[PDB]
Amino acid sequence: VDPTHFEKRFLKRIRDLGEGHFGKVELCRYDPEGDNTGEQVAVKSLKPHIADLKKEIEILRNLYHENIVKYKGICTEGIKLIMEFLPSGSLKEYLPKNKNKINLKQQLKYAVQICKGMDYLGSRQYVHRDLAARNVLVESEHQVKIGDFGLTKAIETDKEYYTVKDDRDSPVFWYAPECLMQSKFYIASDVWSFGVTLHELLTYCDSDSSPMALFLKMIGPTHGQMTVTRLVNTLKEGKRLPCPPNCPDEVYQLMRKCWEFQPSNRTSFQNLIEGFEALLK
Amino acid sequence: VDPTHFEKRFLKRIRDLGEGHFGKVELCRYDPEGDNTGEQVAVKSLKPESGGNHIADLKKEIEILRNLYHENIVKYKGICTEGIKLIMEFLPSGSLKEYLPKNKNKINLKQQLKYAVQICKGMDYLGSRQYVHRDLAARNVLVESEHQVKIGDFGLTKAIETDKEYYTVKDDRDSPVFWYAPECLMQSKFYIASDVWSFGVTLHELLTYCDSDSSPMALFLKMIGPTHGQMTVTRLVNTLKEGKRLPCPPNCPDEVYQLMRKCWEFQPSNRTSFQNLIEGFEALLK
Numbered sequence: 001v002d003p004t005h006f007e008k009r010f011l012k013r014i015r016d017l018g019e020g021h022f023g024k025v026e027l028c029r030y031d032p033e034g035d036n037t038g039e040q041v042a043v044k045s046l047k048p049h050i051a052d053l054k055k056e057i058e059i060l061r062n063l064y065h066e067n068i069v070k071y072k073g074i075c076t077e078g079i080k081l082i083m084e085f086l087p088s089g090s091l092k093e094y095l096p097k098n099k100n101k102i103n104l105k106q107q108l109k110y111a112v113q114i115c116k117g118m119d120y121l122g123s124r125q126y127v128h129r130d131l132a133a134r135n136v137l138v139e140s141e142h143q144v145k146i147g148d149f150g151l152t153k154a155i156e157t158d159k160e161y162y163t164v165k166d167d168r169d170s171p172v173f174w175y176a177p178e179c180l181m182q183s184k185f186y187i188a189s190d191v192w193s194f195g196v197t198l199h200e201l202l203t204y205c206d207s208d209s210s211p212m213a214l215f216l217k218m219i220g221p222t223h224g225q226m227t228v229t230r231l232v233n234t235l236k237e238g239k240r241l242p243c244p245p246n247c248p249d250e251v252y253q254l255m256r257k258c259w260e261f262q263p264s265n266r267t268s269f270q271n272l273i274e275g276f277e278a279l280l281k
Numbered sequence: 282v283d284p285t286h287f288e289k290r291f292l293k294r295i296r297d298l299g300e301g302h303f304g305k306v307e308l309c310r311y312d313p314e315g316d317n318t319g320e321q322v323a324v325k326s327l328k329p330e331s332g333g334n335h336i337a338d339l340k341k342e343i344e345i346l347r348n349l350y351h352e353n354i355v356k357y358k359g360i361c362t363e364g365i366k367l368i369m370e371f372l373p374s375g376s377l378k379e380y381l382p383k384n385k386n387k388i389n390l391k392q393q394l395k396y397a398v399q400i401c402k403g404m405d406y407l408g409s410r411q412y413v414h415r416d417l418a419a420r421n422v423l424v425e426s427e428h429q430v431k432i433g434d435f436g437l438t439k440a441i442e443t444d445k446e447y448y449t450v451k452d453d454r455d456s457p458v459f460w461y462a463p464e465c466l467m468q469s470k471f472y473i474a475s476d477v478w479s480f481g482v483t484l485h486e487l488l489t490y491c492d493s494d495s496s497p498m499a500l501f502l503k504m505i506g507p508t509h510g511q512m513t514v515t516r517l518v519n520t521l522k523e524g525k526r527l528p529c530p531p532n533c534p535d536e537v538y539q540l541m542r543k544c545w546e547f548q549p550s551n552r553t554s555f556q557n558l559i560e561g562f563e564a565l566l567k
């Protein structure tokens with residue numbers, strides 16, 4: 001028996017956790033004993049792309065970090081990715097419900113954990129391209145994990161970026177200028193996405209203060225197919241998301257270094273970890 | 282009796298000529314005698330909707346066209362008030378988009394260059410009156426006769442303020458991005474030289490007899506990708522930055538293609554003028 005092989009006949013659907021256009025993530029029970037005592041797992045599968053999900057599987061099987069969601073295995077007929085289930089869900093779900101428990105100190109410790117997960121990923125020569133609050137899972141009050149790698153790409157040795165073609169469905173309000181303007185993704189482009197994710201965490205992921213809501217207030221909600229060129233315009237003019245309410249100026253200044261127009265300027269994840277760790281002393 | 286006053290009770294709707302998000306142009310017969318001998322007219326009006334004010338903009342459109350008089354600009358006839366309507370002459374040949382694909386055998390390069398000249402004289406007259414058109418495309422160039430075209434729609438036209446070089450726009454929902462200059466796509470600024478860039482695209486259309494498989498949209502999408510959705514425009518700006526342009530139309534002589542390329546200099550300041558284009562074409566026609 002291979003402990004990473006899940007047989008389809010024992011993988012019982014409970015409900016949907018999420019979807020995109022091409023597939024979904026379901027809560028299942030792997031129940032070989034047929035008595036409802038089996039472990040709960042999160043199962044990623046395609047709608048009736050296959051190559052890309054195989055690639056995603058091979059990336060996560062080989063990532064080992066306490067701030068990256070655990071790979072458990074595969075179900076093969078078509079293929080399914082089996083992951084650990086984190087019943088608290090994402091920061092987008094958990095923060096609005098737990099404001100009274102989660103103070104600034106705990107927000108700064110989630111930020112450090114996200115930076116350590118991201119720095120580990122970058123050390124393996126990967127660019128995530130989708131870092132947002134909806135992709136950061138809560139293991140417990142004290143610990144978060146990056147929970148999805150559906151857009152993750154390898155940077156070739158000697159090169160600094162990966163160029164993307166499949167850019168329909170881009171999370172434009174989290175993207176660095178070089179990503180919007182030229183579809184180039186650097187480690188520095190995840191640093192920019194981390195700054196937006198930090199902004200979300202410090203707003204307790206409220207909908208009315210989302211990066212999208214706030215950017216649309218800046219450029220206009222009408223606009224349509226001109227939305228991204230107007231966004232690049234306002235980033236060009238030097239404008240950024242505003243300081244979250246109640247956020248100390250020195251936390252805001254670490255955030256702002258994620259958002260230097262030029263990738264080569266921007267802070268590293270290691271510098272961010274040292275900046276936050278200084279504020280927690 | 283005001284001859285520019287059309288009474289609703291005599292304005293008989295025939296069919297739709299065109300539609301936009303907020304309004305339409307319709308073929309009507311103005312038939313006061315009630316025996317179907319009255320004149321056919323093209324009638325611009327708003328869909329019942331309206332709001333962010335379509336009505337104010339349509340009344341501005343009417344005041345712009347009422348006061349334009351040029352043989353290469355469609356004729357104002359009047360208004361109908363009831364939700365106002367803009368009454369214009371009807372040109373049964375329609376736009377270059379309808380007429381050229383049906384008349385390839387009759388319209389040779391000499392006739393194409395004469396049409397180019399007549400659009401440029403129309404446009405030069407509009408720029409002389411301090412207006413920026415912002416929608417110059419073959420679908421907006423009407424055919425009077427095999428020998429004469431007229432600019433037939435002014436729905437986006439704007440006044441450049443005195444002492445100013447451009448107009449900046451805010452409602453850019455529904456922009457004809459494949460006809461737009463870099464300064465238009467990047468910063469929603471519209472110069473006289475922006476209408477020169479749109480003219481170049483319009484010339485390309487005329488030289489391809491408006492075939493749909495050779496349209497500016499069809500050919501740009503083949504360069505950048507028919508995919509892309511919301512990223513289409515930033516990919517287009519990228520393509521233009523890198524110096525790529527619509528290719529020479531089949532059978533187009535290089536000397537005509539060179540006049541078209543001077544329309545498409547990246548900086549507005551480096552583009553040819555309408556009076557330069559007229560001179561260029563007239564040199565080729567001698």
Ligand SMILES: N#CC[C@]1(n2cc(C(N)=O)c(NC(=O)C3CC3)n2)CCN(Cc2ccc(-c3ccccc3)cc2)C[C@H]1F
Binds near residue numbers: 024042053087134137
């Ligand atoms: N991260 C995170 C968030 C997700 N998550 C994961 C868990 C978990 N492991 O416990 C979870 N836990 C809950 O919610 C607990 C409160 C109940 N949530 C995982 C992502 N999906 C979105 C999505 C869906 C499909 C595809 C896809 C599939 C195939 C091809 C191409 C794309 C991409 C992304 C959303 C969430 F399911």
Ligand SMILES: N#CC[C@]1(n2cc(C(N)=O)c(NC(=O)C3CC3)n2)CCN(Cc2ccc(-c3ccccc3)cc2)C[C@H]1F
Binds near residue numbers: 355370434
């Ligand atoms: N030019 C030109 C082309 C048009 N045209 C005009 C004629 C004509 N005069 O004979 C015509 N003649 C034919 O076709 C002859 C073959 C049968 N065609 C005029 C433009 N519309 C498009 C359109 C429609 C509404 C609005 C609008 C309205 C209100 C608010 C906001 C927008 C904007 C643009 C398309 C054509 F009707």
